[PDB]
Write a protein that binds this ligand. Structure first.
Ligand code: UDP
Ligand code: UDP
Lengths: 277, 277
């Protein structure tokens, strides 16, 4: 049903490069306070630059640590959200950063890799672009690998409301690649909703045959607090309900620490980047 | 908004007993393979029997361990699902057990306490019945206390679709009490959907003023596997969407262990026990 590559792809980098056929490739690393891991991520990919990869940027999303200086010292082009699109005031969240990154790149193909990876494989990018390069009509490639939000919230909600996407193992995965034509044609959900939004919109518009998923081997759970997962789940839900035509209250999740706190949720997507042309 | 008792209730057992005023109290312990903890739970409550508590049963939900013999050796009346209602074939899941327990009790008030508690407080039952006994119009009392499904799935979904219930700290809590009149008037969701179903139905029919929540002090996370949480979340979602008028696919969550497995979900509620009269 869904083109799934279960084992190590066999394509060599030179085959893949040859297969580009004039198409270009941009790589985007969104980054918010990832000073510990950003350089390792950049280094895993920079040997591809001027070859398979035509372009690499770090999309810095307001870091106040050493993310930017360290990315620069690893030879990466670093682009702030403001620089990506300076006529338009910056909103918080991941989705804003990824959407803005479209204005700061020009590749026919765009690859996203999270900047929080601990020793990422140097073949992530080649493995992700394979189906886009080699085939016809694949426009989106998702990764999978051996989380709580994914397995308790997103996958069960998909089974409930878009069971056709039940075969996708990591719908929330931060590692994926897509054609510019697709990406600039889709709205971008705010915050942590962006991946699930892109997947449902992609499916609704082109169906499964435009989607592939590739095995990246092994990944281990980021350690983050429960409360951040709470807010994340809320935004994933808001984005998922909206794509399925269901009205969301717009009310943020409240949590009680013995004290009460309400986290922000957003029901506002960014429009297709195409309108900004 | 929602009557919440944040500290230790001050009512003494003799006040509470006096406040019954001819009303009776049943206690139900649903149990599936809880041989390690069932006796401690029964013992925490049996000193109340023939006083505040008029009736205690263990609703045995198909145990194949020593649950039943150990409950009997602690002086509990043990009722199988079949015995609770023998003309009607037994379905799997928690909701079936709780629903059936209504036919095996006759208290004006029914208290549910999970049978998997590690050293439960002997005041759980007095604390839960307090608002039902002392006041007017409270028909349902939920507990709260210092889980993943609760905080990632149920609370965020309530915020999305029934934000009025956002102030409920433990919507999925297995410890609660209610009037028979209320309980026999509501359908019972299958599986792990039963608590969330009772809460939403209660709210929709009587509003918040009929609902209270009481502090039980401290509770610690049951250790159960992620996959069981996956199936649990799916059923909670199915029950929640249905109460909110949203169609659920009826498709079970699938998980990939490198091998694939699909877990059951049910879109079938039991009707109000009243129709069985
Ligand atoms: O407003 C944001 C939030 C996240 N990210 C980036 O998106 C990626 C995934 O975010 P996540 O919160 O999952 O990673 P974490 O913060 O736990 O390291 C990270 O590399 C972040 O640096 C970002 O650029 N802007
Ligand atoms: O089909 C079921 C499932 C659960 N329970 C009871 O409902 C309570 C809560 O179930 P849960 O799965 O949360 O507890 P666990 O199995 O982890 O001990 C337990 O005491 C169970 O014995 C039951 O009677 N029948």
């Amino acid at each position: 049903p869904l083109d799934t590559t279960w084992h190590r792809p066999g394509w060599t980098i030179g085959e893949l490069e040859a297969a580009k056929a004039g198409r270009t490739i941009s790589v985007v690393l969104p980054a918010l306070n990832e000073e510990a891991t950003i350089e390792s991520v950049i280094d895993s990919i920079s040997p591809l630059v001027d070859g398979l990869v035509d372009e690499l940027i770090v999309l810095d999303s307001g870091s106040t640590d050493d993310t930017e200086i360290r990315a620069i010292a690893s030879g990466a082009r670093v682009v702030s959200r403001e620089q990506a699109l300076p006529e338009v005031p910056v909103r918080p969240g991941k989705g804003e950063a990824l959407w803005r990154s479209l204005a700061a790149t020009s590749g026919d193909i765009v690859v996203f890799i999270d900047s929080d990876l601990i020793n990422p494989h140097p073949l992530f990018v080649p493995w992700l672009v394979g189906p886009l390069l080699t085939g016809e009509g694949i426009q989106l490639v998702k990764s999978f690998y051996r989380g709580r939000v994914t397995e308790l919230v997103a996958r069960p909600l998909l089974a409930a409301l878009r069971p056709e996407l039940g075969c996708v193992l990591q719908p929330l995965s931060g590692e994926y690649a897509a054609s510019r034509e697709l990406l600039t044609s889709l709205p971008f959900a705010p915050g942590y909703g962006v991946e699930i939004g892109l997947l449902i919109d992609t499916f609704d518009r082109l169906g499964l045959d435009a989607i592939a998923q590739v095995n990246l081997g092994v990944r281990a759970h980021r350690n983050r607090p429960l409360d951040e997962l709470g807010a994340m789940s809320r935004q994933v839900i808001a984005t998922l309900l909206s794509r399925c035509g269901i009205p969301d209250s717009g009310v943020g999740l409240t949590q009680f620490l013995y004290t009460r706190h309400t986290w922000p949720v957003s029901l506002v997507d960014r429009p297709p980047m195409k309108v900004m042309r």
